[PDB]
Amino acid sequence: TYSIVAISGSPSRNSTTAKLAEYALAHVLARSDSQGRHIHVIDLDPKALLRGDLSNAKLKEAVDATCNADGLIVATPIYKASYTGLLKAFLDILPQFALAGKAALPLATGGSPAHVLALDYGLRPVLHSMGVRHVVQSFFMVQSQFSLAVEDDVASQLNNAIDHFRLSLSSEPSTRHLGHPRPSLDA
Template sequence: MPSILAVSGSPSPASRTVSAVDHALSWLADRGHRTAHLAVRDLPAAELLAGARDTVAVREAFDAVANADGVIVATPVYKAAYTGLLKAFLDLLPENALAGKVVLPLATGGTVGHLLAIDYALRPVLTALGADHVLPGRFLLDIDIARSEAEGVYLAPQTEKRLIETLERFDGALDLRGIGFSAARPQLDAEAGDLALANGSPAAVGR
């Protein structure tokens, strides 16, 4: 089964973004995928901000990205864009680090006014890193995500439904990856277009 890495860029230790990512990875793991979660906030800040690529922690993070078949890139939206913490990590990645991978952007925010941050802020960077197929992604409202020690992660029913629909598309794209993106492109484009419409996104298919 494909291996999936989630890269989350929230600076908060009590992050709704991380809660949503853990929920998504649990769903994918239940379907047999190998999953891992790289929280950028756990990398040494001095190394990250200094652009140090040759340290043990940063090299291990690069290896985790390189070895993944699918990558979930998750971030809260601050000031209409993804976090500076995530940007610092993406800036360090080698050229074409996402080539050959299926990439799913996932964002959380306090208002639907931040919805377009996926397409206008995050997607161009993922494309610049060589991603062959970037799904339209999913935006989740903070108010729809909760976490407790007793019950774990809770998503509002409609949010849960939309996230699972997105993960099913991600899962399907990972399966198509095995036959090659060129051969699978018509189906990938059709599915991405359907998801963009469902998500209320103006994303151009295949960007």
């Protein structure tokens, strides 16, 4: 029994990014012994989020759920050649090595295929600052393609990424600190 948490960071309502994250979350749960939740950063209290105010219950619950996950699905539109400020603001309040022991799947969408590398150059180093155990391949989609009613090659790549994410999930308590530079100092 795995706990899977998706975090999507578009600041727009009805975002393609959120739909991609949800798709991925469903795909994983359909194929593994998992329960899940989907944190839409846009639905968190803006003031409490920016100030890291964990007296806000819903923010503290989102942080706790992230720290308790076995796998994270981390999704963002590409803004100014990187992940959104909104997504990063959430990542910023997590504990220093919040991602110790965890698998992760980076997802993004954007207007142009030019944005593909923002995940691997931008988001990936941020996940690794937090002691993450295993980040699988990035997947990026051009926004006017998500409909899955998508091109067969694109669909394969996405599904393969999600498959790998699911396969990387760990039951074993022995792995719970892996990725942390100093496992005995918690995680």
